[PDB]
Amino acid sequence: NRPNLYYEVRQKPSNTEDFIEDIVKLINGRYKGQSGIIYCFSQKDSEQVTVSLQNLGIHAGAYHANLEPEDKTTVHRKWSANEIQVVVATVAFGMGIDKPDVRFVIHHSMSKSMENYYQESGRAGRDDMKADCILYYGFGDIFRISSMVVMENVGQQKLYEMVSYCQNISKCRRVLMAQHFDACNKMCDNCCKDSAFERKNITEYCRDLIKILKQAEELNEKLTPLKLIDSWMGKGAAKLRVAGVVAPTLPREDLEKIIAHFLIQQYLKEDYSAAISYLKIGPKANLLNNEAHAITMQVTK
Amino acid sequence: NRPNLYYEVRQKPSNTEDFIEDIVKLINGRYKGQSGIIYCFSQKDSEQVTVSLQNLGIHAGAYHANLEPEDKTTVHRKWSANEIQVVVATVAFGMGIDKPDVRFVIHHSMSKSMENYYQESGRAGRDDMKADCILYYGFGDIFRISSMVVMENVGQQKLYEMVSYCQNISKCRRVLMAQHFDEVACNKMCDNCCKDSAFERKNITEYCRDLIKILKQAEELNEKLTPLKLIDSWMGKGAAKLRVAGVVAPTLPREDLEKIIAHFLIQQYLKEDYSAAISYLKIGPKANLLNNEAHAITMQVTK
Ligand SMILES: [Zn+2]
Ligand SMILES: [Zn+2]
Numbered sequence: 150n151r152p153n154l155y156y157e158v159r160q161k162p163s164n165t166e167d168f169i170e171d172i173v174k175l176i177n178g179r180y181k182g183q184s185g186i187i188y189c190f191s192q193k194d195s196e197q198v199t200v201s202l203q204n205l206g207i208h209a210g211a212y213h214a215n216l217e218p219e220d221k222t223t224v225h226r227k228w229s230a231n232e233i234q235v236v237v238a239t240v241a242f243g244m245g246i247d248k249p250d251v252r253f254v255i256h257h258s259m260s261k262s263m264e265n266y267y268q269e270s271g272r273a274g275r276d277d278m279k280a281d282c283i284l285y286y287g288f289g290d291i292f293r294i295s296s297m298v299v300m301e302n303v304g305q306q307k308l309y310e311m312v313s314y315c316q317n318i319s320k321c322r323r324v325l326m327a328q329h330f331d332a333c334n335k336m337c338d339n340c341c342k343d344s345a346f347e348r349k350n351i352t353e354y355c356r357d358l359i360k361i362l363k364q365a366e367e368l369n370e371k372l373t374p375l376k377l378i379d380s381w382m383g384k385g386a387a388k389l390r391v392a393g394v395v396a397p398t399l400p401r402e403d404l405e406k407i408i409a410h411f412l413i414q415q416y417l418k419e420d421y422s423a424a425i426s427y428l429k430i431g432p433k434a435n436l437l438n439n440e441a442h443a444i445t446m447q448v449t450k
Numbered sequence: 451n452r453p454n455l456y457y458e459v460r461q462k463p464s465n466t467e468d469f470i471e472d473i474v475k476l477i478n479g480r481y482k483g484q485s486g487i488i489y490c491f492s493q494k495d496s497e498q499v500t501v502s503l504q505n506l507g508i509h510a511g512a513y514h515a516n517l518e519p520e521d522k523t524t525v526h527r528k529w530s531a532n533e534i535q536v537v538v539a540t541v542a543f544g545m546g547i548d549k550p551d552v553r554f555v556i557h558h559s560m561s562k563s564m565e566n567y568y569q570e571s572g573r574a575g576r577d578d579m580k581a582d583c584i585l586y587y588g589f590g591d592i593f594r595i596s597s598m599v600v601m602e603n604v605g606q607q608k609l610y611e612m613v614s615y616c617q618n619i620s621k622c623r624r625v626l627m628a629q630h631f632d633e634v635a636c637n638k639m640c641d642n643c644c645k646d647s648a649f650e651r652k653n654i655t656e657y658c659r660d661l662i663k664i665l666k667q668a669e670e671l672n673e674k675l676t677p678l679k680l681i682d683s684w685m686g687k688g689a690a691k692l693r694v695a696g697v698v699a700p701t702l703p704r705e706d707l708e709k710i711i712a713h714f715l716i717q718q719y720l721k722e723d724y725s726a727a728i729s730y731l732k733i734g735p736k737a738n739l740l741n742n743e744a745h746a747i748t749m750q751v752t753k
Binding site: 190191192193194212213214215216218221222225238240241242243244245246247264265268269293296297299300301302373420421422423424425 | 491492493494495513514515516517519522523526541542543544545546547565566569570594597598600601602603676724725726727728
């Protein structure tokens with residue numbers, strides 16, 4: 150345990166340039182002149198993010214496996230001399246962190262598992278002073294990561310465990326990392342949540358989605374998470390919409406969090422077309438035949 | 451157990467285009483008009499290889515995570531209808547392989563573990579007909595992958611077992627798999643089962659002691675040695691301060707000197723040290739056993 154690390158989970162902005170502007174707002178405001186790391190999902194993201202941050206005036210350097218040894222030592226020296234402020238790295242990192250004053254490690258995408266997020270965020274605050282660990286959570290990142298870690302052993306479970314972390318809005322972050330491996334003095338984003346919480350019933354929200362999928366399989370169709378959301382919100386190809394299913398009066402990112410809820414509790418299940426995720430009826434959809442069964446998710450009152 | 455797959459390991463050409471030409475000669479040699487998969491280590495590997503294969507007349511398609519739905523379906527559609535012959539893919543694959551006639555699976559780079567290689571090479575021969583799984587093994591691939599798997603709990607040990615599979619030239623390929631899985635009839639469907647040679651047991655203990663001199667001297671010179679620098683010092687090349695007086699460069703080929711160091715690494719006479727994606731070789735946990743003048747290190751070599 151590292152008591153000097155403040156764990157925080159933010160909602161990933163759906164627009165790419167809105168996301169980067171928010172990062173630049175943090176790099177220039179809160180972290181002016183402080184070294185940090187930005188972890189990414191692939192090598193292209195690390196390069197794509199580095200380009201944007203550099204255009205906005207941030208001294209950033211990409212770091213992935215396909216870097217030549219000459220360019221790695223370059224980023225090493227410059228970042229260790231604080232001449233480069235942030236290394237926009239990939240998972241090709243971690244073990245060679247002789248930097249004690251890492252003040253923030255932002256996650257442009259969620260980690261493949263909680264053990265990985267502990268290691269990657271663990272690069273922050275090695276000097277035992279205060280440091281922040283931001284984790285930007287996006288619905289789509291669940292599926293571009295799942296198809297890659299599904300072939301690993303228990304890898305899909307290790308990702309849904311990472312999803313539960315980002316979904317949780319009340320339990321302490323350090324408890325959400327500790328008991329996966331089985332004294333946070335208000336040092337995370339959920340402990341400082343003074344607000345109260347309600348348990349919301351979203352059972353018919355689940356039965357409506359099963360209507361959309363049963364009809365889809367009767368139409369010889371497979372629904373990606375976007376197609377399911379679009380049909381839910383009364384958009385997309387009209388034949389996939391179910392007559393009687395009302396588009397909820399909630400934000401899109403709130404409907405994403407509900408589908409990810411049904412996924413990790415296995416009311417829905419993932420099916421693949423190799424790097425393409427399709428949502429299907431899950432093993433726990435059976436329990437919805439009891440007219441009294443109910444599904445709950447914690448909201449803010 | 452897939453008894454219709456011929457597993458074989460080949461040495462990876464250190465020259466880039468020489469490797470591609472070898473692959474092209476195989477795609478247009480016995481795999482003409484046959485669908486296959488080329489597995490790579492990263493996204494850029496798949497794109498760089500896809501370009502080189504295309505410019506030589508091969509219908510190839512890159513595939514990784516940072517594609518797009520419009521581009522993924524296009525690859526699925528083209529490649530499932532035999533319009534594309536090979537998909538140059540990263541580990542971003544899986545159960546989408548409803549194609550049952552994959553006839554050859556080539557790994558442009560070594561896998562990260564034995565599970566991944568049994569899973570990635572398992573994309574071939576789904577229709578139970580004969581299919582080939584050719585694994586090219588390169589010394590430098592150990593350290594492109596090791597940086598990404600050290601933080602994955604037991605990723606280093608799982609990669610070193612994948613290296614052991616590549617270093618083996620006697621044990622049956624299906625045997626080497628099964629013992630990893632704790633499982634319990636190859637029918638001469640692997641390269642080592644089809645070998646007709648006898649194998650010499652060679653003592654390389656002094657080769658280990660010689661390298662340990664090179665590493666002990668590099669520490670007193672305030673120097674960390676990459677695997678390349680360790681070999682170049684061994685071969686009497688590179689920086690002159692880093693070669694040790696009396697350590698003679700062996701009369702073995704370069705790739706034979708890599709296999710010896712790879713043996714010492716996976717047997718923990720040497721160990722890895724990182725500067726995050728830059729791997730350094732250092733004295734390992736078992737080099738202390740070399741105080742015993744009777745302790746010997748051996749390696750099976752061809753006769
Ligand atoms: Zn807390
Ligand atoms: Zn055999």
